[PDB]
């Protein structure tokens, strides 16, 4: 205590469930802990869809119910939240880490180390030499006659580089093995590798959760984040906590190109945010050995990430499916309901039911689909301007046998009085079963077609009430021929 988790993307394309994983982890460790979740935009290397992805990351954030406590629109203590509005900051801060000789100014060409590589006997593969250490004032000074652009390096401490994981345990770095390291371009902009710890370092993250992609990076954010200590720009060296890669279909990484990873394609087909949320949330993790249906509260009070396992996590749809559904299935009615319609509705999908009978048909629904988009198929024959019988139903049911099927319900049906289920079910089952004595699921079928258009509907009784007395007739009469 007290926890400060961070997280910070750069805004460049749709969020991928990957990161959206890391951010849920952060979110729910802040939470567990009695924590701060902290929003940074690494926007310091802007591209062109930059804003449209900015966009995207925080409609994501809020569509899955993930509020951060610091970062955009809200503020903090430890501001600005948008890496490119803190300029002076990097600025400042590597103007002090050169003159405390934290750091310091290199001015060696590639091929000016490859050849003292070669000079060594060493093989030129290996990194920066440290060269430049032990350069003169005048050799500097002449340098910047000549118009050569030096970076700024850290100074590595010449020691074993290890740290304690808190997924992967403890990881060590051979003494001597990581060169001192830019920190920053030619043209005297901070990289990556000064702005994040920089960041992390002034915005007093505690415990950094992040890919293990990024693992390699850790040893020189440590000695940097140990230089800052010495410099007093910060006091204490966050936890590290490397968070196991998701996978594909093949043994490599989940792409970007597979549409799988794109959290809004989810979003699309008809995943709610709780049934998204349990999934990711097993994307390294579980949360008991006896289930893993949770929702977020459940996952909030049992997650601490130093149960994150460091065995990579494989991506299953079939999974992910399975859980929305139950998902979906927990949702009261009135609230699925209301799902359901704006779901259809924004997708250019109305049902046109009234209120009432489409809340009936929404009943129906919710045990029978995986996602909300599931609905557009079974229900639009609901819309006149929908209907079409399906050319293999009509060939199947709708021949020599259909028509005494169609005449005996067309006798059956036009003397129920009240047009409900239970009546339309009572009449039809004693003209077709009982009356001309077939197997229900043959009595039926022809009638499913006339009425639905296809061999596969909602239940077929509760479906005619819905469609009312008079268009349940007209699409009988008319299915006869």
Known sequence: ???????????????????????????????????????????????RDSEESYLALLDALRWLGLDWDEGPEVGGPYGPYRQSQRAEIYRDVLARLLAAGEAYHAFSTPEEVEARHVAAGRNPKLGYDNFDRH?????????????????????????DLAWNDLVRGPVTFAAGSVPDFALTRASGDPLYTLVNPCDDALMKITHVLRGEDLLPSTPRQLALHQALIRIGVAERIPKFAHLPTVLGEGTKKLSKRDPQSNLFAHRDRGFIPEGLLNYLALLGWSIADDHDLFGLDEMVAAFDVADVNSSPARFD???????????????????????????????????????????????????????????????????????????????????????????????ALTSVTDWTAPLIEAALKDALIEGLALKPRKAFSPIRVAATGTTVSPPLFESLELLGRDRSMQRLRAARQ
């Open 1 to 47: 205590e007290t926890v400060r988790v961070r997280f910070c993307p750069s805004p460049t394309g749709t969020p991928h469930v990957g990161l959206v994983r890391t951010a849920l982890f952060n979110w729910a460790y802040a939470r567990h802990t009695g924590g701060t979740f902290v929003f940074r935009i690494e926007d310091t290397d802007a591209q």
């Open 317 to 411: 749809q079939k999974k992910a499916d399975a859980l929305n559904a139950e998902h979906i299935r927990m949702l009261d009615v009135g609230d699925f309901t209301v799902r359901l319609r704006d779901h259809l509705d924004t997708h250019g999908h109305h049902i046109a039911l009234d209120e009432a009978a489409f809340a009936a048909a929404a009943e129906l629904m919710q045990t029978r689909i995986v996602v909300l988009g599931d609905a557009w198929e079974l229900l639009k024959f609901f819309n006149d301007d929908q209907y079409v019988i399906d050319p293999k139903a009509a060939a199947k049911e709708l021949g020599p046998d259909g028509a005494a099927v169609l005449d005996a319900a067309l006798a």
């Open 135 to 159: 350069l003169t004032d005048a050799q500097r000074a002449a340098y910047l006659a000549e118009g050569r652009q030096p970076v700024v390096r850290l100074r590595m401490p010449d020691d």
